[PDB]
Amino acid sequence: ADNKCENSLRREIACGQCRDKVKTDGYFYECCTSDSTFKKCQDLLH
Numbered sequence: 001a002d003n004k005c006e007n008s009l010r011r012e013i014a015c016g017q018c019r020d021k022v023k024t025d026g027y028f029y030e031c032c033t034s035d036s037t038f039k040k041c042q043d044l045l046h
Contacts (some may be wrong), residue, residue, distance in 0.1 A: 005032040014042040 005012040015031030018041030031038040 001033055003035055011035075011038050011042070014038055014045045017045050018042075 005015070012032065015028045015038055019025070019027035019030060031041050
Protein backbone atom coordinates (compact mmCIF):
# COMPACT_ATOMS: atom_id res chain seq x y z
CA ALA A 1 0.00 0.00 0.00
CA ASP A 2 1.02 3.65 -0.31
CA ASN A 3 2.38 4.09 3.21
CA LYS A 4 0.15 2.78 6.00
CA CYS A 5 0.26 2.18 9.76
CA GLU A 6 3.64 0.58 9.04
CA ASN A 7 5.48 3.90 9.27
CA SER A 8 5.40 6.09 12.37
CA LEU A 9 2.61 5.49 14.88
CA ARG A 10 2.19 9.26 14.61
CA ARG A 11 -0.38 8.67 11.88
CA GLU A 12 -1.73 5.48 13.42
CA ILE A 13 -2.74 7.32 16.57
CA ALA A 14 -4.69 9.88 14.59
CA CYS A 15 -6.68 7.48 12.46
CA GLY A 16 -7.26 5.56 15.65
CA GLN A 17 -8.83 8.15 17.95
CA CYS A 18 -10.30 9.60 14.77
CA ARG A 19 -12.41 6.77 13.35
CA ASP A 20 -12.71 5.69 16.97
CA LYS A 21 -14.51 8.82 18.18
CA VAL A 22 -16.64 9.48 15.11
CA LYS A 23 -16.88 6.04 13.47
CA THR A 24 -15.67 2.66 14.72
CA ASP A 25 -12.65 0.36 14.79
CA GLY A 26 -13.82 -0.76 11.35
CA TYR A 27 -13.19 2.56 9.62
CA PHE A 28 -9.68 3.17 10.96
CA TYR A 29 -8.71 1.21 7.86
CA GLU A 30 -9.73 4.16 5.67
CA CYS A 31 -6.87 6.33 6.87
CA CYS A 32 -4.41 3.55 7.63
CA THR A 33 -4.74 2.86 3.90
CA SER A 34 -5.31 6.34 2.48
CA ASP A 35 -3.08 9.26 3.44
CA SER A 36 -5.32 12.03 2.11
CA THR A 37 -7.83 11.03 4.78
CA PHE A 38 -5.28 10.82 7.59
CA LYS A 39 -4.59 14.50 6.93
CA LYS A 40 -8.27 15.14 7.64
CA CYS A 41 -8.28 13.03 10.79
CA GLN A 42 -5.09 14.38 12.35
CA ASP A 43 -6.52 17.86 11.79
CA LEU A 44 -9.24 16.98 14.29
CA LEU A 45 -7.15 15.01 16.77
CA HIS A 46 -4.47 17.69 16.83
